[model samples]
Target chain A: GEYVVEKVLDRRVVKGKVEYLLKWKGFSDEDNTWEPEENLDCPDLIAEFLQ
Target chain B: GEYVVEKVLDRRVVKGKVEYLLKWKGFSDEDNTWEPEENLDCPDLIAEFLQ
Candidate 1:
């Protein structure tokens, strides 16, 4: 399955950092995770999945 | 203090129940919680409060 973002759950700057709460493609709802923006390549893909 | 939704963390049905992850007004990031829709008054207020 293609990598799709279920939703952009939350965004926050901790210690002057960015964190995106992400529900990854083909993953269970309970498996959702919060990943730093830098770790996500093409970070722009993040916005398209916002609910 | 007014209740504000900094973000919609996740929407889920647990044991046939609808729950919303909410960040209320005047609260810290760690205080975010998942609440049943029924327990929330003016349910429509939920969306208006989304990020």
Candidate 2:
């Protein structure tokens, strides 16, 4: 199964691409991972994180 | 960082192949994902699940 997003925790820009710190559903804070915008499918979470 | 398996919740065979239901660390029960044994590196969790 695909990894689901719980929330977006942080954001940054690298190499002209946006990366979001992803808090995955059913995982802990220590397991949060960073993913580039292109690698993510949740637009609402991204926008909410930015706001 | 790599995805951490909190515990192996359940197991089954699909097409004569084994798949483990994984409960990821820091995530909720609703977020548990099913992963094949080969896709995981945590042998301890696998062994524990079988036990």
Q: Please provide TM-scores computed only on chain A for all of the candidate models, following their numbering.
A: 0.60, 0.79
- Candidate 2 at residue A23, lDDT? 85
**Residue B10 of model 2, lDDT score:** 93
* Model 2 chain B poorest 10 in a row by lDDT: B34-43
* Candidate 2 residue-wise lDDT at B36: 63
TM-score of each predicted structure versus truth: 0.37, 0.48
The model with the greatest TM-score is 2
lDDT of 1 by residue, A1-51 (tens): 013565677778899889878775556778676766753543445656453
Q: Give the per-residue lDDT of model 1 (tens digit) for B1-51.
A: 013455566678999999887765556767677876654544345666563
DockQ (C-alpha based) per candidate is 0.02, 0.06
Please, what are the lDDT tens digits per residue for candidate 2 over residues B2-51? 34678888998999888889887666788777766654666678789879
Error of 1 at A47 (Å): 2.8
Query: Which residue runs of candidate 2 sit more than 4 Å off their true CA positions?
Result: A1-51
